[PDB]
Amino acid sequence: YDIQAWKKQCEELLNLIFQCEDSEPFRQPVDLLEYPDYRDIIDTPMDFATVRETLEAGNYESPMELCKDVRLIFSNSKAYTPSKRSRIYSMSLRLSAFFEEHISSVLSDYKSALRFHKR
């Protein structure tokens, strides 16, 4: 029932993601010189360095907010891919599967802890 435990659990999960080769295209903002029309397609760019910085700045109140930003990395990849067989999109699908598998217990534990706090 530790209401704060999600933060370190999210830092460790972000460390795992950074070690994964599939995270390479998503570790820093999409390069607008490389993809000049990116902002015509994507309204809200997001990447794992921005997620890690928001977390370290104390600017996420819950793991749900972190999860919404991480999911935005994956939905941006899906929206910008010209094909469902592209390299970067294929990497995003595996990384999303890994992320969802690991974040489930973090979300569950946090929601359980908050319900106990207000019991």
28 binds ligand UUV (CB under 6 A): no
- Residue closer to ligand UUV (CB basis): 38 or 109: 38
CA 19 to chain centroid: 14
Interaction between residue 96 and ligand UUV (CB under 6 A)? no
Residue 17 touches ligand UUV, criterion: CB under 6 A: no
18 is a contact residue toward ligand UUV (CB under 6 A):
no
User: What are the E-state strand segments in the chain?
Assistant: none
Do residues 41 and 80 make contact, with C-beta atoms less than 8 angstroms apart? yes
User: In Å, how far are 6, 25, 43, 50, 53 from 37, measured between CA atoms?
Assistant: 36, 17, 11, 21, 26
3-state class (DSSP) for residue 47 = coil
Among 89, 95, 96, 99, binds ligand UUV (CB under 6 A): 89
Task: Give the shortest CB-99-to-ligand UUV separation in angstroms.
Answer: 15
Footprint of ligand UUV (CB under 6 A): 25-26, 30, 35, 77, 80-81, 86, 88-89
